[PDB]
Amino acid sequence: LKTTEYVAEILNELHNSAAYISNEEADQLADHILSSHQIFTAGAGRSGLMAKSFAMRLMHMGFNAHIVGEILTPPLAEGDLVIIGSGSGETKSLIHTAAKAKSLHGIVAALTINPESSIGKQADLIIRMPGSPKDQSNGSYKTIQPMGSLFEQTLLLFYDAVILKLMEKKGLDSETMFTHHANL
Amino acid sequence: LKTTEYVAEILNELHNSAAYISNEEADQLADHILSSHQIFTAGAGRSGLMAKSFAMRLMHMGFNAHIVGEILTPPLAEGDLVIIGSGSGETKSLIHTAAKAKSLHGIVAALTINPESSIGKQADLIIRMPGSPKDQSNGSYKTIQPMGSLFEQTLLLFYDAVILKLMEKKGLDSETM
């Protein structure tokens, strides 16, 4: 295949995966971002990178956004949000993050294939992601890509869409858009 | 209005945008990756995040992948490839990177909206990205999202498409990874 055909193939995969996400949980996420005084994102590897890109945009929008596990991460307080992207829902690091977060009476929101997983079970809000063996045998999910790729891409677009819904709720657009980005 | 609808909006913007890329360039980037003995990715901010995603997946295929500007990045020798993602092609940190790389006889590929930009003029391979004033005035390029969002999403999708082409050329699939 041509590289551009692979791009288009990828975008085909992302269609079946996207829409399939439930609005009620998603749109609830945006309200939590609006209330909580602090917001933390989290993920491992490539999912970690996507979490970072979301926190970057949130900061640009002027939320007190943070990334779990960086050098200058502040302590979570009661009420703060924690957003966790994890396919498996099993990554031991992020289990600990959710558990520790709930103990401090933070709110945990998990984005995962497996709502029943160790991370899902802890979450106050689950945004269920496609990729289940049931989804695959269904025809509701399929992929040509090495493991993680489609789920990681779904995180990005999903995160960026949450950005759009926050702009809307705050009455802004990609033209007005004043972003708080680094200077030096 | 609803988040899943905005997802679809983004999907729409990507369909118009993504495939808008030239394969002659693309497949030659895959060609270069298989040639060079060391591969370096590069970017700033979010584009930097995408390039880290690339290098990681390139690492997974057993390529000699690194990311410009990390603690353990080794020195570039002649022949090596450096892949640079820059919307405007005018990020100062990356201009230097591009410059230094060529000045060391490395091969430079740049993924920018502006081929004649500072970074463009330094590159051996350009992968022109969608977003130009022309394409804007044309009515072909529209984005409802904060600046760079679309270019960045595109970078990621392209990088993962390039991974797939590399798998094809190496005769492997999702399983063998």
From Swiss-Prot, chain A:
Q: Got any disulfides in this one, which pairs?
A: none
Sorted alphabetically, which InterPro entries does this protein's record hold? PHI/rmpB, SIS_dom, SIS_dom_sf
Pfam family name, one: SIS
According to its UniProt record, this protein's enzyme class is isomerase
Name the residues annotated as catalytic in the UniProt entry: 152
Binding positions (substrate): 47, 86-91
The record's induction entry says: By formaldehyde, under the control of HxlR. Not induced by methanol, formate, or methylamine.
Q: What is its EC number?
A: 5.3.1.27
What's a single GO BP term from this record? formaldehyde assimilation via ribulose monophosphate cycle
Which pathway does it serve? One-carbon metabolism; formaldehyde assimilation via RuMP pathway; D-fructose 6-phosphate from D-ribulose 5-phosphate and formaldehyde: step 2/2
Q: Report which reactions are catalysed by this protein.
A: D-arabino-hex-3-ulose 6-phosphate = beta-D-fructose 6-phosphate
The task this protein performs is described as: Catalyzes the isomerization between 3-hexulose 6-phosphate and fructose 6-phosphate. Together with HxlA, may act as a formaldehyde detoxification system.
Read off the NCBIfam families from this record.
Answer: RuMP_HxlB (TIGR03127)
Q: By what name is this protein known?
A: 3-hexulose-6-phosphate isomerase
Its lineage opens with: Bacteria, Bacillati, Bacillota, Bacilli, Bacillales
